Amino acid sequence: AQNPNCNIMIFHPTKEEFNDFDKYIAYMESQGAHRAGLAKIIPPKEWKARETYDNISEILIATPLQQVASGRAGVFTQYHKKKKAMTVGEYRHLANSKKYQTPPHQNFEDLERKYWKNRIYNSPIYGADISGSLFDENTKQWNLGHLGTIQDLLEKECGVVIEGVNTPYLYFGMWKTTFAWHTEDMDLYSINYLHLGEPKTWYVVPPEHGQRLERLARELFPGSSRGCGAFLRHKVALISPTVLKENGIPFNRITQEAGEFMVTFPYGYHAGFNHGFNCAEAINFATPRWIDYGKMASQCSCGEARVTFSMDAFVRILQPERYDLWKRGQD
Ligand SMILES: [NH3+]NC(=O)c1ccc(-c2nn[nH]n2)cc1
Numbered sequence: 582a583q584n585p586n587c588n589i590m591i592f593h594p595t596k597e598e599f600n601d602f603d604k605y606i607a608y609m610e611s612q613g614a615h616r617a618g619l620a621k622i623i624p625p626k627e628w629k630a631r632e633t634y635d636n637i638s639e640i641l642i643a644t645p646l647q648q649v650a651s652g653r654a655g656v657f658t659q660y661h662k663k664k665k666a667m668t669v670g671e672y673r674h675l676a677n678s679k680k681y682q683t684p685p686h687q688n689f690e691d692l693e694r695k696y697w698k699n700r701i702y703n704s705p706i707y708g709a710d711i712s713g714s715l716f717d718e719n720t721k722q723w724n725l726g727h728l729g730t731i732q733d734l735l736e737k738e739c740g741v742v743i744e745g746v747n748t749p750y751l752y753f754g755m756w757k758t759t760f761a762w763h764t765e766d767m768d769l770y771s772i773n774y775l776h777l778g779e780p781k782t783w784y785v786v787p788p789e790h791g792q793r794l795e796r797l798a799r800e801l802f803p804g805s806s807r808g809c810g811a812f813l814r815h816k817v818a819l820i821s822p823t824v825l826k827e828n829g830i831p832f833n834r835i836t837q838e839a840g841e842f843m844v845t846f847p848y849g850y851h852a853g854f855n856h857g858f859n860c861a862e863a864i865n866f867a868t869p870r871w872i873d874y875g876k877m878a879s880q881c882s883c884g885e886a887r888v889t890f891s892m893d894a895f896v897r898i899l900q901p902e903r904y905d906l907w908k909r910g911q912d
Pocket residue numbers: 707709752753754758759760765771851855
């Protein structure tokens with residue numbers, strides 16, 4: 582069995598290997614990459630996303646979100662407070678202000694230590710889920726706006742057309758902006774390209790061990806758990822690497838830098854934080870190997886989670902017994 586310890590693998594495709602997206606995902610899996618839940622892909626030197634980032638300041642962040650924590654430094658939830666709209670140029674200036682700028686630090690480990698010590702005492706602002714793309718239309722390899730759609734994948738695997746579309750999203754981050762522990766909607770894959778700026782640190786639990794993380798989360802957030810049997814679907818809970826280690830939870834960590842892709846695999850729980858001002862682009866995708874994960878994915882039906890109408894067809898077709906109750910939770 583490949584990659585039996587479930588390490589995060591890093592790949593360096595050649596320009597030729599970068600042509601066929603789907604083929605390379607399958608190749609990574611043949612090497613056991615999926616066992617970790619996350620892989621890093623470093624593009625060949627010949628490749629570029631777009632020519633420059635000099636002209637992005639006028640993009641609008643219509644609803645920046647302030648991420649306010651409660652709890653303890655290693656075990657906390659966060660809620661998103663809506664702020665007034667601002668441009669990417671305005672948000673960059675805010676990220677670099679004394680209030681929000683990254684502190685002086687020696688290396689990525691020293692910054693990580695500072696993050697876990699101090700995150701809860703600050704409330705960073707970030708831009709999330711902004712439909713759009715920064716890949717140039719002429720970039721033919723690994724352009725996140727031009728991957729096979731999930732709806733076409735289900736049609737090719739299972740036989741029936743469904744409604745829905747599948748387009749990328751942009752994210753603008755600053756120091757301490759935080760992504761809570763989660764798997765993707767319907768346990769899909771995701772891919773994330775860090776276009777510009779400071780790094781993003783990721784934590785990931787192997788898919789084979791995801792129920793260990795779920796168990797711990799129920800223990801650590803007991804009121805949440807009573808409320809919803811899939812509360813990690815709400816994407817609000819943080820548990821530090823120290824606490825995971827204390828509890829014996831298998832996990833790994835890695836830092837993504839500008840110009841690198843990260844792929845998350847079906848049912849790979851992940852969380853992390855941004856080092857400073859940055860811009861990333863991400864989208865969910867499927868392969869044939871996803872279909873069984875999608876059939877088995879937990880669902881939140883308590884109301885809290887709420888998602889793109891595109892998830893409706895996936896539930897309806899893959900999970901007909903659960904559909905009516907899930908649909909009640911979407912209202
Ligand atoms: N599936 N979405 C993610 O894994 C994800 C979600 C949000 C963020 C984020 N970056 N700064 N705050 N949150 C980063 C990644």
